[PDB]
Amino acid sequence: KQYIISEELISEGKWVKLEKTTYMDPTGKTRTWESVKRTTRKEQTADGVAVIPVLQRTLHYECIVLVKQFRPPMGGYCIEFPAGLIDDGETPEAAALRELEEETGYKGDIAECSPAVCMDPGLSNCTIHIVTVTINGDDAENARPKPKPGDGEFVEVISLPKNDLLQRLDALVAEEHLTVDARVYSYALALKHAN
Amino acid sequence: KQYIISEELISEGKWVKLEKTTYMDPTGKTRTWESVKRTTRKEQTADGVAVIPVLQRTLHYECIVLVKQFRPPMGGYCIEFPAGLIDDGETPEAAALRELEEETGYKGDIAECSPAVCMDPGLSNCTIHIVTVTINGDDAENARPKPKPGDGEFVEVISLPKNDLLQRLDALVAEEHLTVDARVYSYALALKHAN
Numbered sequence: 001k002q003y004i005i006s007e008e009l010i011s012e013g014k015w016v017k018l019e020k021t022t023y024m025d026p027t028g029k030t031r032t033w034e035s036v037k038r039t040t041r042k043e044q045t046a047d048g049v050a051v052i053p054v055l056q057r058t059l060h061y062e063c064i065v066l067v068k069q070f071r072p073p074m075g076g077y078c079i080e081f082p083a084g085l086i087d088d089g090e091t092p093e094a095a096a097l098r099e100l101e102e103e104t105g106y107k108g109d110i111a112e113c114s115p116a117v118c119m120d121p122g123l124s125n126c127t128i129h130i131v132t133v134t135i136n137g138d139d140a141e142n143a144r145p146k147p148k149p150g151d152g153e154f155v156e157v158i159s160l161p162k163n164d165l166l167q168r169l170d171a172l173v174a175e176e177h178l179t180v181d182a183r184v185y186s187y188a189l190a191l192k193h194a195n
Numbered sequence: 196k197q198y199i200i201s202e203e204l205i206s207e208g209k210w211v212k213l214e215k216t217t218y219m220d221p222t223g224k225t226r227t228w229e230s231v232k233r234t235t236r237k238e239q240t241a242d243g244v245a246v247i248p249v250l251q252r253t254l255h256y257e258c259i260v261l262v263k264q265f266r267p268p269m270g271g272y273c274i275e276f277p278a279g280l281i282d283d284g285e286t287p288e289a290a291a292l293r294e295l296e297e298e299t300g301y302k303g304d305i306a307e308c309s310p311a312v313c314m315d316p317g318l319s320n321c322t323i324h325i326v327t328v329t330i331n332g333d334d335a336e337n338a339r340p341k342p343k344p345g346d347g348e349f350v351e352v353i354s355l356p357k358n359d360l361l362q363r364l365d366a367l368v369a370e371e372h373l374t375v376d377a378r379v380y381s382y383a384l385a386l387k388h389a390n
């Protein structure tokens with residue numbers, strides 16, 4: 001019912017570009033929108049993956065493995081699912097498994113992989129696949145979770161019980177300069193709403 | 196140990212701006228990052244709200260009320276939680292009840308409200324509050340909801356069984372090309388993963 005008429009570059013960077021989008025509304029009227037896009041994506045099904053890593057251990061409730069890291073655009077630290085861009089020819093599932101190991105040291109198994117879902121559709125065309133990954137936390141390999149020496153940057157791992165995720169996220173945000181990711185928080189809400 | 200050292204504007208548009216952010220890592224090294232920001236931002240609690248509206252009717256399954264609309268940045272239709280910006284001096288709960296009524300016609304009650312949470316920290320500083328709102332679908336107010344869409348807003352309302360949300364989402368995606376929002380998908384995933 002509505003159709004893209006054209007997309008004009010406004011400004012460019014090495015990773016992000018601002019565009020102006022002309023589209024037709026249902027009435028027939030031309031309208032415009034300022035849209036953000038990454039310059040990085042090309043062939044992949046989506047820009048990246050977010051990983052929902054379910055840490056399963058015989059003596060414990062299931063935990064969700066999250067990472068905390070400084071996020072320049074936020075000018076602060078954020079708590080998020082492990083996530084990253086997907087590489088070329090690399091499948092979402094593979095990107096997820098790699099990204100998880102690199103950021104946390106855990107070796108997981110694919111449980112499921114979502115279609116491409118949007119991050120902030122009013123602002124950008126950015127999409128990811130949400131990949132659920134189980135981790136056997138009793139396996140000796142996952143006893144000593146340590147990222148590869150030169151994985152990349154400064155990431156802290158934080159595991160939280162599934163049965164209390166929302167409360168535990170709220171606690172961390174309170175003290176203080178931490179922002180929880182919106183997908184993490186939405187996941188935590190459903191966990192609570194389903195008890 | 197990590198902080199923002201400077202923000203160099205790269206391009207500003209009527210709605211959105213792109214800039215380069217210099218920050219200090221824990222090693223004491225200087226690094227940049229291309230970040231996005233809505234040109235419209237004030238001293239508030241967040242940029243906007245997203246509403247998780249739970250439609251409740253006696254002897255019925257609970258439903259989640261979602262909206263579908265064309266999103267210029269995506270060049271196509273997306274399925275999202277109702278959402279909009281917060282007004283001056285307006286609480287998030289108030290903006291939530293208001294935005295819900297505008298887009299869907301439903302009159303709900305505040306169940307709970309999140310701290311500000313980040314939309315896509317690797318890209319932008321954007322934040323929202325996620326507000327859980329219950330809707331008494333048996334109340335006369337809610338028997339025949341009347342959406343009052345703002346100018347140039349064309350929003351279709353869709354209610355899906357909470358009990359079967361993920362599969363119902365997949366079933367919509369199957370019927371035609373559209374993109375499910377990542378916050379919605381995260382919510383629906385956790386409903387299945389719960390305990």
Ligand SMILES: Nc1nc2c([nH]c(=O)n2[C@H]2C[C@H](O)[C@@H](COP(=O)(O)OP(=O)(O)O)O2)c(=O)[nH]1
Pocket residue numbers: 032033034035122123210211278279280
């Ligand atoms: N990025 C961007 N935002 C815009 C433009 N035009 C415009 O009006 N906006 C604002 C309007 C909206 O604030 C927002 C789109 O998000 P949504 O969930 O639809 O918000 P709402 O329900 O309106 O509050 O961007 C534009 O060209 N670009």
Ligand SMILES: [Mn+2]
Pocket residue numbers: 277278279
């Ligand atoms: Mn809206």
Ligand SMILES: [Mn+2]
Pocket residue numbers: 278279294297298348
């Ligand atoms: Mn609106």
